[PDB]
């Protein structure tokens, strides 16, 4: 699973998530990366909301769904202390959720940012209960993406302990991006590989922002790079399902409009996040926000999103 969160120079936030789901899953199984409130969340400051907040999740899909973690994190981040709010959410609303009390271990990760105001104060954090999680972050002013394999400390137990880190950033046409390329066990073997795709994904988002793009288009450009890595379980290289076929989940949310787009069980499209973003975009102009399976493919093709008919399945 891959994800990204973006804030532009005005405090407009966006979030997206893309995944290939569980290996050998039954055909048509849709997971967290497609589900409203679960895979990602983005919400600009407003009446109640003193902060703009963006969240993207990773790890065990079912664990993330049952606790609606992305939205839960965004609501907790309206509290004054962001570090403490996220840590308590991960401990109490995730690991200790009654919705997961049957589970022997709760496995998940999250990336967040929140901003508030002509200076923009961005706080960004990542937290995970998996052994590790690869992140990358970049601001348009620092102009050099930083990547980091966050690991659980010695003595921690994967699925029972929480790791959490983060930082702060004061920001024209700039902005800030944080991405992740998977939360689970890691191998030092392809650790530089995850770090490299995270760096490139940050650079693409930053370049989009520096060209005047909307937050949603910049977060989508980040996820396109993350998907395209043959090493990530999203887009190309997604785990194969029980029938040895590709079925992708992806979604995106805009903090300003609160509009949402999502695809589930999608095969034959190179970049699932692009269909999610096109659904969100076309929906701003009763438009659909969530398409699955055969109809999602046909809708993507009809809108000129690059396809792979040889990778598309349509069983009877």
- Say whether residue 63 binds its own copies (CB under 8 A): yes
- 157 contact choice in Na ion, its own copies, Cl ion, none (CB below 5 to 8 Å, kind-dependent): none
Query: Binding residue for Na ion (CB under 5 A) from 3, 109, 235, 255?
Result: 235
Binding mask 10-49 for Cl ion (x = CB under 5 A): ---------------xx--x--------------------
- Say whether residue 288 binds its own copies (CB under 8 A): yes
CA–CA gap between residue 139 and residue 118 (Å, rounded): 17
CA–CA gap between residue 72 and residue 39 (Å, rounded): 11
Segment interacting with Na ion, rule: CB under 5 A, options 30-38, 120-128, 236-244, 252-260: 236-244
CA–CA gap between residue 51 and residue 47 (Å, rounded): 10
Q: Which two tokens stand for residue 274?
A: 């692009």
Burial class of residue 192, CB neighbours in 10 A (0-12, 13-18, 19+): exposed
**What φ, ψ does residue 106 adopt, rounded to 5°?**
-125, 120
- 182 contact choice in its own copies, Cl ion, Na ion, none (CB below 5 to 8 Å, kind-dependent): Cl ion
Nearer to Na ion by Cβ, of 209 and 246: the residue is 246
Q: Which two tokens stand for residue 42?
A: 């983005």
What residues are paired with 15 via a beta bridge?
5, 253
Q: Which residues of 36-45 are buried (b: 16+ CB within 10 A; e: fewer)?
A: bbbbbbbbbb
**What φ, ψ does residue 33 adopt, rounded to 5°?**
-65, -15
Nearer to Na ion by Cβ, of 43 and 247: the residue is 247
Binders of its own copies among residues 109 to 138 (CB under 8 A) are none
- 235 contact choice in Na ion, its own copies, Cl ion, none (CB below 5 to 8 Å, kind-dependent): Na ion
Binders of its own copies among residues 176 to 215 (CB under 8 A) are none
- Say whether residue 30 binds its own copies (CB under 8 A): yes
User: Is 1 annotated in the active site?
Assistant: yes
Instruction: Please tell me the total number of residues recorded for the chain in this structure.
Output: 316
- 237 contact choice in Na ion, its own copies, Cl ion, none (CB below 5 to 8 Å, kind-dependent): Na ion
**Cα dihedral 195, 150, 5, 12 sign:** negative
User: Which residues make up the interface to its own copies (CB under 8 A)?
Assistant: 22, 25-31, 35-38, 43, 46-47, 60-63, 65-66, 68, 71, 98-99, 102-103, 247, 257-260, 264-265, 286, 288-296, 298-299, 314-316
- Kindly list the residues in this chain that would bind Na ion in the complex (CB under 5 A): 229, 232, 234-237
């Amino acid at each position: 699973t891959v994800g990204a969160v973006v804030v532009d120079h005005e405090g407009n936030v966006a979030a997206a998530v893309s995944s290939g789901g569980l290996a050998l899953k039954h055909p048509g199984r849709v997971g967290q990366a497609a589900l409203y409130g679960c895979g990602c969340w983005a919400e600009n400051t407003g009446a109640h909301n003193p902060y703009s907040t963006a969240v993207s999740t990773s790890g065990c899909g079912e664990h993330l769904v049952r606790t609606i973690l992305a939205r839960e994190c965004s609501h907790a981040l309206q509290a004054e202390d962001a570090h403490q709010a996220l840590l308590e959410t991960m401990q109490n609303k995730f690991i200790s959720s009654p919705f997961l009390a049957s589970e022997d271990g709760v496995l998940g990760g999250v990336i967040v940012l929140r901003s508030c105001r002509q200076t923009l104060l961005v706080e960004f954090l990542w937290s995970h209960t998996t052994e590790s999680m690869c992140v990358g972050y970049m601001s348009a002013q620092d102009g050099k993406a930083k990547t980091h394999i966050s690991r659980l400390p010695p003595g921690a137990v994967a699925g029972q302990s929480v790791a959490i880190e983060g930082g702060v950033c004061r920001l024209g046409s700039g902005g800030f991006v944080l991405v992740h390329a998977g939360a689970g066990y890691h191998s030092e073997s392809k650790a530089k590989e995850y770090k490299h795709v995270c760096k490139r994904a940050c650079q693409k988002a930053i370049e989009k922002l520096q060209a005047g793009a909307l937050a949603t288009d910049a977060v989508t450009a980040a996820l396109v790079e993350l998907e395209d890595s043959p090493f990530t379980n999203a887009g190309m290289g997604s785990n194969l399902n029980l029938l040895g076929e590709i079925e992708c989940d992806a979604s995106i949310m805009d903090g300003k409009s609160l509009n949402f787009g999502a695809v589930g069980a999608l095969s034959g499209i190179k970049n699932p996040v692009s269909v999610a973003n096109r659904l969100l975009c076309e929906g701003q102009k009763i438009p659909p926000c969530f398409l699955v399976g055969e109809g999602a493919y046909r809708w993507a093709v009809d809108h000129g999103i690059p396809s792979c008919p040889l990778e598309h399945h349509h069983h009877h």
